[PDB]
Design a protein around this ligand. Structure first.
Ligand SMILES: *[C@@H]1O[C@H](CO[C@H]2O[C@@H](C)[C@@H](O)[C@@H](O)[C@@H]2O)[C@@H](O[C@@H]2O[C@H](CO)[C@@H](O)[C@H](O)[C@H]2NC(C)=O)[C@H](O)[C@H]1NC(C)=O
Ligand SMILES: *[C@@H]1O[C@H](CO[C@H]2O[C@@H](C)[C@@H](O)[C@@H](O)[C@@H]2O)[C@@H](O[C@@H]2O[C@H](CO)[C@@H](O)[C@H](O)[C@H]2NC(C)=O)[C@H](O)[C@H]1NC(C)=O
Ligand SMILES: *[C@H]1O[C@H](CO[C@H]2O[C@@H](C)[C@@H](O)[C@@H](O)[C@@H]2O)[C@@H](O[C@@H]2O[C@H](CO)[C@@H](O)[C@H](O)[C@H]2NC(C)=O)[C@H](O)[C@H]1NC(C)=O
Ligand SMILES: *[C@H]1O[C@H](CO[C@H]2O[C@@H](C)[C@@H](O)[C@@H](O)[C@@H]2O)[C@@H](O[C@@H]2O[C@H](CO)[C@@H](O)[C@H](O)[C@H]2NC(C)=O)[C@H](O)[C@H]1NC(C)=O
Ligand code: MF5
Ligand code: MF5
Ligand code: NAG
Ligand code: NAG
Ligand code: NAG
Ligand code: NAG
Ligand code: NAG
Ligand code: NAG
Ligand code: NAG
Ligand code: NAG
Ligand code: CA
Ligand code: CA
Ligand code: CA
Ligand code: CA
Ligand code: CA
Ligand code: CA
Ligand code: CA
Ligand code: CA
Ligand code: CL
Ligand code: CL
Ligand code: CL
Ligand code: CL
Ligand code: CL
Ligand code: CL
Ligand code: CL
Ligand code: CL
Ligand code: K
Ligand code: K
Ligand code: NA
Ligand code: NA
Ligand code: NA
Ligand code: NA
Lengths: 527, 527
């Protein structure tokens, strides 16, 4: 029977049988006062503290959010929807520790993605028990507020300052610093990892001084703050806030009066209305995201990154081969998860208008031109694949490379990966390839469960990746030193070497998407 | 490797490990042409027939339907939502046969509920593998069209005749008659069982001459056609059709022209709009249900039942202790699944207006009067429990008793049960009690899986019920003859004996809800 005295009180965990061993799980530990009533839109408040035991024996509420209902009954999409009740009372975290209790274990802290509008830490593919079991690290994950409730910004106004969700994560990091030692963890050895919006969060923690000493190093999967979807401008932030305000009947003169009006609405009213604060969104739209609040973020992060104002430490960064494809079935004409989505030139062009709504004809023609230099074939899937590549390079890959490039320029080790294995169990069609989000299950070691219809090769690769991530956390160097693995070289802005992760031919390459990324990083912004 | 030659072609099944034995499953066998294009709103068409093997190795598409999203992330509600893609191409059935292949097995055919608006046969609690394993019966289940796509009625007009979903089920019954022998089943021994709207369907099959010879006997769980939600009047049917027609921009002069206009809409457009064809619905509202079509149903079923025009055979009928409670959190004021729902007198009265929208003040006062004869206490949950009882007696229990009473009057054995055990794993709060829908998992033998956190007592009861249902199917007599069970007496209109199903004190009682049901069955209709 396992009970740990945290600084706020005793908590009770539960034993799990994993791989002929035991992992101890503490699910749903509160780390802040529920942000309700007057506390809505505010930075999280610290916890009351209690006597008696808190039973941390089931996942807690997920934060209020809208759920994707494009494919009801379809596991490919539904595996991402929350699996606990939605509630504003959602500020909880989870802790997986090895058994027997580790002496001074390295801690991995997961920050989920979801475009800052969705997400929860209780998803099956974020289960930290395998990592705890296999690498004897401690895994921690937290729920943080999303959408308007997490990122509504009326900057400098503390009734709704912006970046609340980011402060939720930060307060959870503080919790770990203050309490993890009681669980057998080492507060001086904490590695943040996250995917997509979670990875962007991780990159922002590297930039936020308040977070500087709450972690040791950082892993960024398919995301970074400099991705075009990741940061909300102040013009956007205020326009979007005032729009939510009119939509809900909360337009008032004294901005502080808007917030109290919004404080009195149902969560549902807010949620139902946040979709429309943008006149013409994209599938990748982030209505309420990170802003330069002058608190979490002292300045525009592009400036910070460029002038080397960030935590000096190691990073592990990477992307997947077909980042863009998932988004294509969420609005691009002629695309379907139920057919092979062979599209024509005109549908390609209409898809661009969908993904680049405010861009000139010349801008969209340049994308067309750069991405239709057929290779050198006339295959029917030319345009289908070009559009996925367009969406993936622009939104994920090129920003990831650029971040790593600028980060390493200030003299810290960086490691870059290209994940190109497609899950044999992927419920999405073959044309979508190695999708956004689908390295995560390899990272968390789900293929290590033989009872699960992953291939033998998939167990090897997951085992290998799990070891690399773990060695990165413990030692700041993502090698697999024992099974003749390819050695993972540091990413330097000169040669720009990266490691490909796959089941077959693993290797070192250089300058991922070189031409594509000079188009997006250098040319496209002038357009 | 198992392959069965059906009359339409070879099908391939798959082996399942169940309880140290094998069950063979054929999931997703087509039994009709997909009802698409010109076939929308029509009675199902017979199948083309194929060469090569059909792989019946995964559940098929569920039929188009709206999904309950009141409690996103909550297992209590989400366990009922479809778990395969929604598609109009949904006319498929499933077959579980014992291993080794049975010689002449009795067949149970499951018809799911869902208020004729929702439902699918691929739900976890409808898994027929346990029944196949334990009782060596063959279990069959089918998907049938629901909502407007299954029950849109413009009577006598064969472009949309009504009762299409009922004809889907019937065509599936035909499939069994024609093919089950090839699976080791006995077409001369087929028992229909269903819950809620599925049970109402079963009762209508007893009344439909086209179904007379497609089955042997019948089990009706929490439902019958004479329930107030179960049959759509012709005034309602046409008003609702014409309303869907205006909502979708399909109002035309030649009724046949309405249907072609509706034939050309997206399923989604139809689905989105079927909610509003009723000006003031209830939580129990069935917008598009069974009608007297002059085909499946030759006359108003109340008349048929009363004059003894129905299949002469045995029936097993029953209800649960707290049928009504589930519906209370779907619109009654002051109710919540997250608190104890103590409501006051005025909230009780407002709840009545919600559940009896078209009823006079005197009508609603009579309900109030009949259900507030406190017993003889002044407990705070008086009104909360009275409202659940009101909704349960009116909508499920009293109609069930009345059906059994009138059916047995024509000289066939009838057996009535009162299920009063609450699942120890029920995710809904304690106040909701023994809920509508939650005997089903006991019937299908889920507690027989020891790996599943059901209690030992729950395994006993499930084992017992599984045996009773199986003996009923095989022999038309639901006894458990071996383990000193209470003997289940026939329900006669004189004494009206019934069997209570529970974990503790099992027993024979008489005249379930006697006073409540004379109020609803005799008095209330005059009101
Ligand atoms: C691949 O599918 C798309 C997506 O939409 C369709 O999905 C199919 C499975 C089918 O059910 C179809 O009825 C459904 O609309 C097809 O694009 C669609 O084409 C139709 C017909 O002109 C248009 O009305 C729709 O606007 C359009 N939908 C989208 C998203 O553009 C596509 O034609 C199909 N092509 C193939 C087989 O490659
Ligand atoms: C039990 O809960 C109901 C349902 O609605 C509430 O659920 C609670 C868990 C809480 O989050 C609350 O904010 C939420 O609205 C309560 O009824 C609600 O009471 C509020 C306050 O007046 C009304 O504004 C709502 O109209 C009303 N909802 C409904 C469905 O009527 C109810 O008061 C609560 N009571 C208890 C503790 O027994
Ligand atoms: C932000 O401000 C306005 C707000 O307009 C929006 O209002 C919301 C309620 C929502 O429904 C959305 O669809 C709608 O566009 C943006 O809209 C334009 O603003 C002009 C006035 O400047 C208005 O007359 C119109 O409502 C609207 N016109 C059009 C054709 O869009 C505006 O685009 C945006 N400004 C930004 C992005 O800074
Ligand atoms: C069925 O016919 C009419 C249709 O009206 C409905 O129209 C749908 C589009 C839907 O949105 C629904 O909300 C709406 O009520 C029913 O409505 C009434 O009919 C009168 C004319 O007879 C109209 O003037 C109104 O639209 C409407 N009035 C009110 C206050 O309800 C009508 O109730 C129903 N008849 C039945 C049940 O037989
Ligand atoms: C949170 N997340 C991380 C990685 C990969 C996927 C997800 C969530 N996926 O939900 C499915 C989904 C998608 F995959 C989308 F591309 C999209 F635009 C959606 F709106 C959407 F809901
Ligand atoms: C199909 N079914 C059979 C038995 C019990 C429940 C169900 C389906 N339950 O879905 C949850 C649910 C309910 F339990 C309801 F009472 C209700 F009114 C809904 F609209 C609803 F969606
Ligand atoms: C927490 O768990 C234990 C055993 O599961 C229980 O006995 C204890 O009282 C619990 N506290 C609760 C339910 O609040
Ligand atoms: C754990 O490791 C750190 C160094 O990273 C060390 O300073 C600390 O004292 C250790 N705590 C132990 C051994 O419990
Ligand atoms: C806005 O309202 C708040 C709350 O009363 C108050 O502090 C302030 O005086 C108001 N500001 C303006 C501009 O009137
Ligand atoms: C190394 O090799 C052995 C067997 O070859 C394997 O069981 C072990 O898990 C491998 N380790 C890693 C980290 O891949
Ligand atoms: C059906 O299943 C078998 C083995 O699983 C496969 O080899 C056969 O070709 C399948 N037919 C298909 C996939 O259409
Ligand atoms: C199965 O049982 C029926 C009687 O219910 C019998 O007439 C039929 O011939 C049997 N078929 C066999 C033994 O295969
Ligand atoms: C309705 O339209 C159909 C289809 O053309 C046709 O059979 C019939 O003549 C029309 N009926 C009327 C009332 O005009
Ligand atoms: C009868 O009794 C034995 C043990 O007492 C039990 O294993 C068996 O399953 C029981 N049968 C039924 C139908 O309850
Ligand atoms: Ca909510
Ligand atoms: Ca540190
Ligand atoms: Ca490539
Ligand atoms: Ca290698
Ligand atoms: Ca549909
Ligand atoms: Ca028969
Ligand atoms: Ca009772
Ligand atoms: Ca007994
Ligand atoms: Cl944005
Ligand atoms: Cl062109
Ligand atoms: Cl090079
Ligand atoms: Cl490349
Ligand atoms: Cl009705
Ligand atoms: Cl009164
Ligand atoms: Cl009596
Ligand atoms: Cl009673
Ligand atoms: K997403
Ligand atoms: K229902
Ligand atoms: Na879902
Ligand atoms: Na997956
Ligand atoms: Na669901
Ligand atoms: Na259940």
């Amino acid at each position: 029977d396992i009970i740990i005295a945290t600084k706020n009180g005793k908590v009770r965990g539960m034993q799990l049988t994993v791989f002929g061993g035991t992992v101890t799980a503490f699910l749903g530990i509160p780390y802040a006062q529920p942000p309700l009533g007057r506390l809505r839109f505010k930075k999280p408040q610290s916890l009351t503290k209690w006597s008696d035991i808190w039973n941390a024996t089931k996942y807690a509420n997920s934060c209020c959010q809208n759920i994707d209902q494009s494919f009801p009954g379809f596991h490919g999409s539904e595996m991402w929807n929350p699996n606990t009740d939605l509630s504003e009372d959602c500020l909880y975290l989870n802790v997986w520790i090895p058994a027997p209790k580790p002496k001074n274990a390295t801690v991995l802290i997961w920050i989920y993605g979801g475009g800052f509008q969705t997400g929860t830490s209780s998803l099956h593919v974020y289960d930290g028990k395998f990592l705890a079991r296999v690498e004897r690290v401690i895994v921690v994950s937290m729920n943080y507020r999303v959408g308007a409730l997490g990122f509504l910004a009326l900057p400098g106004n503390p009734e709704a300052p912006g970046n609340m969700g980011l402060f939720d994560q930060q307060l959870a990091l503080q919790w770990v610093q203050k309490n993890i030692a009681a669980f057998g963890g080492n507060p001086k050895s904490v590695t943040l990892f996250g995917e997509s919006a979670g990875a962007a969060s991780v990159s922002l923690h590297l930039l936020s001084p308040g977070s500087h000493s709450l972690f040791t190093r950082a892993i960024l999967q398919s995301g970074s703050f400099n991705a075009p979807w990741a940061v909300t401008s102040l013009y956007e932030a205020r326009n979007r806030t005032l729009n939510l305000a009119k939509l809900t009947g909360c337009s008032r003169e004294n901005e502080t009066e808007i917030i109290k009006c919004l404080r009195n609405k149902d969560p549902q009213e807010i949620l139902l209305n946040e979709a429309f604060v943008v006149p013409y969104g994209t599938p990748l739209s982030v209505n309420f995201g990170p802003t330069v609040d002058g608190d979490f973020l002292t300045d525009m992060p592009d400036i910070l990154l460029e002038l080397g104002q960030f935590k000096k430490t190691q990073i592990l960064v990477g992307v997947n081969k077909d980042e863009g494809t998932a988004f294509l079935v969420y609005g691009a004409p002629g695309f379907s998860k139920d057919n092979n989505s062979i599209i024509t030139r005109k549908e390609f062009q209409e898809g661009l208008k969908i993904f680049f709504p405010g861009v000139s004809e010349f801008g969209k023609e340049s994308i067309l031109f750069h991405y239709t230099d057929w290779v050198d074939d006339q295959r029917p899937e030319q345009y289908r694949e070009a559009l996925g590549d367009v969406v993936g390079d622009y939104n994920f890959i090129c920003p990831a490379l650029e971040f790593t490039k600028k980060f390493s320029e200030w003299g810290n080790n960086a490691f870059f990966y290209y994940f190109e294995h497609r899950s044999s169990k992927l419920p999405w069609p073959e044309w979508m390839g190695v999708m956004h989000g689908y390295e995560i299950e390899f990272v968390f070691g789900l293929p290590l469960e033989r009872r699960d219809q992953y291939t033998k090769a998939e167990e090897i690769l997951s085992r290998s990746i799990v070891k690399r991530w773990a060695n990165f956390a413990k030692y700041g160097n993502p090698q697999e030193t024992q099974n003749n693995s390819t050695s993972w070289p540091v990413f330097k802005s000169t040669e720009q070497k990266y490691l490909t992760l796959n089941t077959e031919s693993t290797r070192i390459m250089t300058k991922l998407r070189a031409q594509q990324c000079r188009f997006w990083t250098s040319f496209f912004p002038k357009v």
